[PDB]
Amino acid sequence: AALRQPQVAELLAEARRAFREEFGAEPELAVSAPGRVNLIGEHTDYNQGLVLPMALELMTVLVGSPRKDGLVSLLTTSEGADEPQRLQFPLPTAQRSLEPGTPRWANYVKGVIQYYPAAPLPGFSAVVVSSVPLGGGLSSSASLEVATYTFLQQLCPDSGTIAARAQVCQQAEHSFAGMPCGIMDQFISLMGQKGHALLIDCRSLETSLVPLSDPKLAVLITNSNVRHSLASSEYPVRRRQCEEVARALGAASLREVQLEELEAARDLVSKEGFRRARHVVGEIRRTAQAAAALRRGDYRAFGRLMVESHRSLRDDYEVSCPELDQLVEAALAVPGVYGSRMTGGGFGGCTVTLLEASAAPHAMRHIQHYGGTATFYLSQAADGAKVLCL
Ligand SMILES: O=C1CCCC2=C1C1(CCCCC1)N=C(Nc1nc3ccccc3o1)N2
Ligand SMILES: O=C(Nc1cccc(Cl)c1)C(F)(F)F
Ligand SMILES: OC[C@H]1O[C@@H](O)[C@H](O)[C@@H](O)[C@H]1O
């Protein structure tokens, strides 16, 4: 009864309704980009490391039509969007470029338009909707960016690569949302495939599509329903930090650095710095293993590596919060659970629990033993960016 069933036919319906009511015509176009859960490989992406996200059935739909007047008209119905629900603005030019500001939800769309690599980009009308809980750790921002991107490609096809559209979305996040993220979230919103995880090499940008066939094993995403103050603020600090180590170690990134190399170099770098690279360099290894373990389909070693990932993110990288520790520590003591850990950037958001679908009704009865409000998603590994024509 705390479990938010996804309703994706309802999400598109809602979207179509609101559009015809707002603008006076049936929309021509529907796109979706999903939210994500990162199964293992946390704070590795910007250290050119490995990440094992899968796409969620939680998503962000644009529905909309091209305009002859060169201007953009956005209406959002997302519950937690900041006022106003509606912004219009001329397309950028050589002369004027878009500026981030108010409302913030509109900055991600603006961002993508501002860096969209193709021309001529005509003006549009769009309703924006989302079942991705906003600031809940499941990449609402990447779903909206990649949803925008996808809608723009129908207006003006790009002659480019997935990485290029990921980078464009990532630039919008940096410039327009002030969030210096890596490419896991964008990549996965773009490239996810139903019943697969997506093993992303963030040095080479080689990708692997890893079957999650087995219908026994499932994944419980548990929303902590907190986004602590230090989240916004401590992400860039971590990055700056990782940068200095590589700087001091004559290493083009932490990817190339391996743990035997860091152990020796305790004193080349800071004490703070050393306890954090231990996570990155280590993390990178356990994402490889989890990868190789998933192919072998040892649901068990999922745990060792996934529970170890939390410990490392909590004790070493310091991007957990009591609420996460108590959802993780609560899950990892339940028979019928391979393992649990904070997912995405931390200081709040969701845990992810690899468990036997048989014990789903027991875990959701047990957790909601949590000192806070728990929201539950039972996540099929899902499709990436989708167009449907109306
Ligand atoms: O303030 C923060 C902290 C960082 C994470 C986060 C936010 C806010 C920014 C905008 C207003 C609500 C809160 N928004 C997202 N929004 C994401 N917002 C959407 C709105 C409509 C459709 C799809 C969307 O995806 N993420
Ligand atoms: O993770 C899953 N299954 C899984 C199966 C075998 C080994 C491991 Cl580590 C995982 C998922 F996504 F299907 F639920
Ligand atoms: O694993 C940490 C991740 O945090 C996400 O929220 C961020 O957007 C990703 O780029 C990655 O840094």
Residue numbers in the entry: 2 to 369, 371 to 392
Show passages lifted from the paper.
Inhibition of human GALK1 (hGALK1) to prevent Gal-1-P production therefore could provide a therapeutic benefit for GALT deficiency. Here, we determined crystal structures of hGALK1 bound with reported ATP-competitive inhibitors of the spiro-benzoxazole series, to reveal their binding mode in the active site.
Additionally, this crystal system is biased for the detection of fragments binding to nonorthosteric sites of hGALK1 outside of the ATP and galactose pockets. hGALK1 crystals were each soaked with an individual fragment from the DSi-Poised library at a millimolar concentration. Several fragments occupy a hotspot distal from the active site ATP/galactose pockets, on the opposite face of the protein. This hotspot has not been described for any member of the GHMP kinase family and as such represents a novel pocket of unknown significance. The pocket is lined on one side by strands β8– β10 (Leu218–Thr223, Tyr339–Met343 and Gly350–Ala358) and on the other side by the loop preceding β6 (Gly193–Gly196) and strands β6 and β7 (His197–Asp202 and Thr208–Val211).
